[PDB]
């Protein structure tokens, strides 16, 4: 008779849950014919090699791998309070084959299509170097794909972040389903070194003064943060001593990470195109922060390449009201299979702690496995470059040069450590 909130019975809180999708790249241009050169414009004239109903490897998206992708997450069975979406929506094409007009075409059907398929669900959106034309010029003031992008993730964000969105294309969002926890989406394209617009600003669109007040507030204000961005920190692992952004961004924006490193209890990026872990450690090589980079849907690769991706959608694992991270879910269409029977079959590649016999993706639990990976012939290594190309190529190899590359770049994060990699390991 005194209205006390219902105790819930003392069972196990479940696990919460959030999808994790990227680097869509959709060509509208997409379609079946004669000659292989005209199946698709991102192939850019050359012969598509196998092109079938989800795509082809010299190609961008068929809309019809997009909404399979989406289709099994709405059909999975994972519940899950919210979707992280970090950029690249337009194709590989020219940049006279764009416009202006056409980038928020493509961003506004990508959005409309998850909005219509997942009418429920929160989605935090990052641009991606694609999401503007002419593609990598991110500007530092406000303009008419900024605008757009604004008010077409309104259903999603607050007033506050889409008045930054609308500014800078970055925002910070609190997760509605999940107090205490915070969403800060950078604009890390404005750090991409294509990007004339940023040449020699030392703070473009004020996103690193606006990153620390707000990473500031988060820790006095007891929450804790998921950082999203489409460019990742850190270094490329499959070229060496390069920064994926500016190294002057790198340092910086590293630098910050590692001062509040007790409130990101996650970073998130897309660009890539590849399954990658990173661990941000210190100088003296104590861990950090986890870093996790997801592959594209798409699978496109340049006609040089030899690799590619199968596409890929994710899924993270968290602790309620905590938001430690306890597990990602990696999932794959197997594209030749698809395209053969001209079905889709989504399905599971691994589950990160089984498949590396982890307990959890803290730091320290990270930089352990990241130990074992170092080791002459690791398995663990092994398996973790079959899954970089998310299992396209279970006969691709990865020589001494290749995995002193990719070690060096998950384990250091920074120029120095990085480069001191480098003179052990070499
Ligand atoms: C995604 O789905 C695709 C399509 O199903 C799978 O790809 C097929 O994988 C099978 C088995 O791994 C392949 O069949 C095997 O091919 C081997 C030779 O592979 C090389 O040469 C072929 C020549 O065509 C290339 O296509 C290929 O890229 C390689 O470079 C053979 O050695 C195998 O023969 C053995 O199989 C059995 C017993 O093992 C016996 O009958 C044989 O005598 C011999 O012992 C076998 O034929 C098949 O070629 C692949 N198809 C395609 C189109 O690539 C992927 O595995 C799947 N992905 C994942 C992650 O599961
Ligand atoms: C794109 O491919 C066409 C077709 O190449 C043929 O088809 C493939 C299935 C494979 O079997 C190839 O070895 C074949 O040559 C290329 O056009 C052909 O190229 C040569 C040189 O001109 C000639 O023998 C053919 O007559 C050409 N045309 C046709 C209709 O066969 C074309 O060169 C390729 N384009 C690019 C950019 O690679
Ligand atoms: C980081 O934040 C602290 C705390 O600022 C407060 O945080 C919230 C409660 C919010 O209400 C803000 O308005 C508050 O100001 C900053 O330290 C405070 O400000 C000055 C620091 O010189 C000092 O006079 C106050 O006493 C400090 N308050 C407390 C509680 O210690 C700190 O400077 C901020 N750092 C940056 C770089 O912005
Ligand atoms: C997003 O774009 C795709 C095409 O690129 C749209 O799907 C096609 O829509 C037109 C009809 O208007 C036709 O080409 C087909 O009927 C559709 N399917 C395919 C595979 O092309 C889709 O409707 C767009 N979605 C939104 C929300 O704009
Ligand atoms: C640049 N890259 C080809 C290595 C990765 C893909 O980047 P993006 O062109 O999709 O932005
Ligand atoms: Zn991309
Ligand atoms: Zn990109």
């Given at each position: 008779?005194?209205?006390?909130?219902?105790?819930?019975?003392?069972?196990?809180?479940?696990?919460?849950?959030?999808?994790?999708?990227?680097?869509?790249?959709?060509d509208?241009?997409y379609?079946?014919?004669?000659?292989?050169?005209?199946?698709?414009?991102?192939?850019?004239?050359?012969?598509?090699?196998?092109?079938?109903?989800?795509?082809?490897?010299?190609?961008?998206?068929?809309?019809?791998?997009?909404?399979?992708?989406?289709?099994?997450?709405?059909?999975?069975?994972?519940?899950?309070?919210?979707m992280?979406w970090?950029g690249?929506?337009?194709?590989?094409v020219?940049?006279?084959?764009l416009?202006?007009?056409?980038?928020?075409k493509?961003?506004?059907?990508?959005?409309?299509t998850?909005?219509?398929?997942?009418?429920?669900?929160?989605?935090?959106?990052?641009?991606?170097?694609?999401?503007?034309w002419?593609?990598?010029?991110?500007?530092?003031?406000?303009?008419?794909?900024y605008?757009?992008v604004a008010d077409?993730?309104?259903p999603w964000?607050?007033?506050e972040?889409?008045?930054?969105?609308?500014?800078?294309?970055?925002?910070?969002?609190?997760?509605?389903?999940?107090?205490?926890?915070?969403?800060?989406?950078?604009?890390?394209?404005?750090?991409?070194?294509?990007?004339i617009?940023?040449?020699?600003?030392?703070?473009?669109?004020?996103?690193?003064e606006?990153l620390?007040?707000?990473?500031?507030?988060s820790l006095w204000?007891?929450?804790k943060?998921?950082?999203?961005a489409?460019?990742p920190?850190?270094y490329?692992?499959?070229?060496?001593?390069?920064?994926?952004?500016?190294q002057?961004?790198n340092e910086?924006?590293?630098d910050?990470?590692?001062?509040?490193?007790?409130?990101?209890?996650?970073q998130?990026?897309?660009?890539?195109?590849?399954?990658?872990?990173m661990?941000?450690?210190?100088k003296?090589?104590?861990?950090?922060?986890?870093?996790?980079?997801?592959?594209?849907?798409?699978?496109?690769?340049?006609?040089?390449?030899?690799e590619?991706?199968?596409?890929?959608?994710?899924?993270?694992?968290?602790?309620?009201g905590?938001?430690?991270?306890?597990?990602?879910?990696?999932?794959?269409?197997?594209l030749?299979?698809?395209?053969?029977?001209?079905?889709?079959?989504?399905?599971l590649?691994?589950v990160?702690?089984?498949?590396?016999?982890?307990?959890?993706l803290?730091?320290?639990?990270?930089?352990?496995?990241?130990?074992?990976?170092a080791?002459?012939?690791?398995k663990?290594?092994?398996?973790?470059?079959?899954?970089?190309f998310?299992?396209?190529?279970?006969?691709?190899?990865?020589d001494?040069?290749?995995?002193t590359?990719?070690?060096?770049?998950?384990?250091?994060?920074?120029?120095?450590s990085?480069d001191?990699?480098?003179?052990?390991?070499?």
């Amino acid at each position: 008779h005194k209205l006390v909130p219902l105790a819930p019975a003392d069972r196990a809180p479940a696990v919460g849950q959030f999808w994790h999708v990227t680097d869509l790249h959709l060509d509208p241009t997409y379609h079946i014919t004669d000659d292989r050169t005209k199946v698709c414009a991102s192939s850019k004239g050359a012969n598509a090699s196998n092109p079938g109903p989800f795509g082809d490897v010299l190609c961008d998206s068929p809309y019809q791998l997009i909404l399979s992708a989406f289709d099994f997450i709405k059909n999975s069975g994972q519940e899950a309070s919210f979707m992280i979406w970090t950029g690249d929506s337009p194709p590989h094409v020219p940049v006279p084959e764009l416009s202006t007009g056409t980038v928020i075409k493509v961003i506004t059907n990508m959005t409309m299509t998850v909005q219509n398929l997942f009418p429920n669900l929160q989605v935090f959106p990052a641009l991606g170097n694609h999401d503007y034309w002419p593609q990598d010029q991110l500007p530092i003031v406000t303009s008419k794909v900024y605008s757009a992008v604004a008010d077409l993730w309104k259903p999603w964000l607050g007033e506050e972040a889409i008045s930054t969105l609308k500014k800078g294309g970055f925002y910070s969002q609190k997760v509605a389903s999940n107090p205490g926890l915070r969403i800060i989406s950078l604009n890390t394209n404005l750090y991409y070194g294509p990007n004339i617009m940023t040449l020699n600003k030392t703070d473009p669109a004020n996103q690193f003064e606006w990153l620390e007040n707000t990473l500031n507030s988060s820790l006095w204000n007891k929450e804790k943060v998921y950082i999203i961005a489409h460019v990742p920190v850190g270094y490329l692992p499959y070229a060496t001593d390069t920064p994926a952004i500016r190294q002057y961004y790198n340092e910086k924006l590293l630098d910050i990470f590692r001062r509040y490193s007790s409130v990101i209890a996650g970073q998130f990026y897309g660009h890539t195109h590849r399954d990658s872990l990173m661990v941000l450690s210190d100088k003296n090589g104590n861990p950090l922060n986890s870093v996790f980079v997801a592959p594209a849907v798409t699978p496109v690769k340049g006609v040089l390449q030899k690799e590619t991706n199968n596409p890929g959608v994710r899924l993270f694992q968290y602790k309620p009201g905590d938001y430690t991270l306890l597990d990602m879910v990696q999932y794959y269409l197997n594209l030749t299979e698809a395209n053969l029977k001209g079905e889709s079959n989504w399905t599971l590649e691994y589950v990160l702690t089984q498949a590396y016999s982890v307990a959890d993706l803290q730091p320290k639990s990270l930089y352990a496995l990241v130990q074992q990976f170092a080791t002459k012939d690791s398995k663990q290594f092994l398996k973790y470059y079959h899954y970089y190309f998310v299992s396209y190529d279970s006969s691709a190899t990865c020589d001494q040069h290749c995995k002193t590359l990719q070690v060096c770049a998950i384990m250091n994060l920074d120029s120095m450590s990085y480069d001191d990699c480098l003179k052990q390991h070499l």
